[model samples]
Target: ESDIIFQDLEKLKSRPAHLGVFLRYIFSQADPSPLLFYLCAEVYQQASPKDSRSLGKDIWNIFLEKNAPLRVKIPEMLQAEIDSRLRNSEDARGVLCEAQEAAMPEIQEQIHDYRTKRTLGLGSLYGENDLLDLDGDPLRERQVAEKQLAALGDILSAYAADRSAPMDFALNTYMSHAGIRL
Candidate 1:
C-alpha cells in the first residue's frame, strides 16, 4: 500500500495535470468509497506546497485509522483494461473515453467544470498580489498569477449558484489547493 501510494505520488508530482484523471479512475471503481476522492479534493484545494504535504499526511493517517473501512487495493478490473490499452499503444483519448463512460454523472460533471474553469482562467477571478522586483519594476509572473486568480473567481461566481453541485467541490478544491485553511 505504501509503495503504491509512493508510486502514485511520484507519477502525480511528475505531471500534476494527470492528477485529475488519476483521481477520476480511483472514484470510478465498483462500490467506490469517497475517502480517497475527498482526500484528493482536499489536496487540490490546498495548492501550496506546505499545505499539500500536510494534507498528504492527513490522508495517510485517515487511511491508517483502525475503524475506517478504507483499504488501498489495486483496482484489478481497471488495471486489466489499462494494460490491454498500453499493449496496443492506444491513444490517451481512447482510454479517457473508456474512463468517462465508467464514471458517475456527478464525477463527470465535476471533471468537466474543472477543465473548463482551468482553461478559461480561474486565476484571474481571484484578486492576488503582485511583487515588484529589486529594480522596482513590475513582475510579469505576478501579473499573470493575479490575472489567473481573477479569472478563477469569475468562473467560480458563475458556477456558485449550484451550491450543492460538483462545481462546489471543484471550487472548494481549488481554494484548499491554494492553502486556505477552511
Candidate 2:
C-alpha cells in the first residue's frame, strides 16, 4: 500500500541511517545504492565537517575509483564534474554538493517509479511480499500467535519449578494488589 511505502520513505527522511540499514541488510544490494552513498556523504558533512578534503578524497577512492567495490552510477556530466572538481582542489565539499544535487532527483525518480509500480498492483522496489506483511492474512497471524503462546507455555513450565524467587515471578501478587483477584 502507498501508506506503508510512504511510511518507509518518511522513516528514511527522518532517520537517514535506516536507509543504510535497508540497503545493506534488507535489500542486500551488491554495491552500495546511490542513495545510501549520497546519504553517507551528507552524514559525514555533519560528522566531520572540518575535514572536507579528506572526506572528499575518501569518498572518491571508495566510490569513484575504477572498479571500486561501492561504485555508484553517476551521470557522465556529474562524474566529469566530480573529477574536475577533485583535480582543482582536494576539498570535496563542492563535489559532494554537486553529487547530492544529481543524486536527489534520481532518488525521487526511483520513488516515483515505485509509486507507479504500486499503482499497477506490482510489488515494491524491495519486493513487497508476505514476509513483512503488516496486516494481511488472519490465518498467518493466528498461527504466529499460537506459536508465541506455545513458547510462553514452555517458559512458564520451566520457571514454575525453579525456586530462585517466588515473589519475583508471581504475576498474581502484582495483579491482586491492583484489585484483579487473579
Candidate 3:
C-alpha cells in the first residue's frame, strides 16, 4: 500500500523545490496557521484510510504540546475538530462538510490578507528596481518567491486548516515563478 501510494504521489508531478524554503520563511516570520492547516489536512487524507484517524490528532497534539508557534495552531485546531467528530456521534462526512463550510470565509480572508501584505512587502523591498533585482539574482528571486509562497500557504491554511493544500499552492507558485508549469 505504501509503495502504491508513493508511486501515485510521485506521478502527481506538482510541488516545487522551494517549498521547504517557503515554509521555513513563514515559520520564522509571521503566523504559520495557514501552512499548518494545509499540511494537517494532507496528512489526514493520507493516513486516515489505514485506521489512523487518530494519527492527525496525535500529530497536532504533539506539535501543540511542544509549544509550537502560533503558525502551528491552526492544524491543532483542525485536529481538535477531527477528534471531536470522530469521537462523537457525528459522521466523518458530515463533520468534514461542516468544517469546510465554516472555514471558507476565514480561509479566503487569510489568503487575501497574506497576499496583500506580501505584495506590499515585496513592493517596498524592491522599490523601483523590483524587475532588475529579479533579473540580477536568482537566489534573491527565490527569497522573494519564498516570501510569496509563505503568504500563499497562509491563504491555503485558512481554507482547511491543513498543511498540504498550502504546501501544494506554494509549490505551484514557485514553479510558476521559475517558468515551470502544469
Candidate 4:
C-alpha cells in the first residue's frame, strides 16, 4: 500500500538488483494516493524502462498541473492502531514505546513534518478545535505533550550526533516526537 517496502530502496536494489520486480510493484497501484506517489517519485524516476522513463516526471507534473483529485485514508492503518493501543494504556511510556514501534514510514514522516512546521513557536495545539492534542484535562495532557516533544527532540539530535550507536536507542524518541506514543 506504500513505500514501506522501499524505504531504503538503494540498499535492496544495489545488493540484490531487484529493480524490475520492485518497479512493477510500484506502478501496479490503481488509485494511488498523492502521498504514496510523492514518496516513490525517485523510485519511479530511475526505474521505469527507457521508453516509459518520461512517465516518472509526468507523475508529479500531471498531478499538480492537472489539479487531479486524489484521496488518502489511513485511519484504519497506523493512526487507528496507534490510537487504540494508547487508549488501552494508563502508562505513558509503554503507550509511546509500542506506538513508535508500530508506526509506519509515512506516519512517522507526518509527526516529523508537524514538529518542523511549528518552529515559529505557535506553541502546542496551535489554538481552538484541537481538543485531541490535550484531550480533556489541560494539565495532564500538556505534561504528556511536553514529555513526548522532549523525547522526539532528543532522539532527533541523538541520531544526528551518532549514527553508529545502537539504533534502538533512538527509535522511541520518534514516537515521542509524533506524540502518538504519548
Best candidate (score: TM-score): 2
Q: Write the per-residue lDDT of candidate 1 for residues 63-108, one digit (tens) a residue.
A: 2223323323324565355445433444323432343334335444
Tell me the whole-model lDDT of each prediction, alpha carbons only. Answer: 0.36, 0.45, 0.42, 0.32
The most accurate candidate by lDDT is 2
The order by descending lDDT is: 2, 3, 1, 4
Q: Residue 178, candidate 4: how far off, in angstroms?
A: 29
Tens-place lDDT per residue, model 2, 1-182, is 43454335554543212222233222232322455456545644554444555556656655666664456667787787776755555556666767766666656666555555556765433334432432455554344333332332343354334321221222222222222231
Residues 1-182, candidate 3: write the lDDT tens digits. 21122122222122222333334334444455544444444344444354435543443343333453323333456556655665543334434434444444544454444345445664233122332344435666555445555455554555544544534543453355344443
Instruction: Judge candidate 2 against the unseen true structure and give its global Cα lDDT, from 0 to 1.
Output: 0.45
Candidate 4: list runs displaced more than 4 Å.
1-34, 48-52, 71-182
lDDT value for model 3: 0.42
Model 1 residue 102 CA deviation in Å: 7.9
Please report how far candidate 3 places residue 59 from its true position, in Å: 5.7
lDDT minimum window of 10 residues, candidate 2: 163-172
Give residue 154's lDDT in candidate 1 (0 to 100). 47
Model 1 residue 132 lDDT score: 17
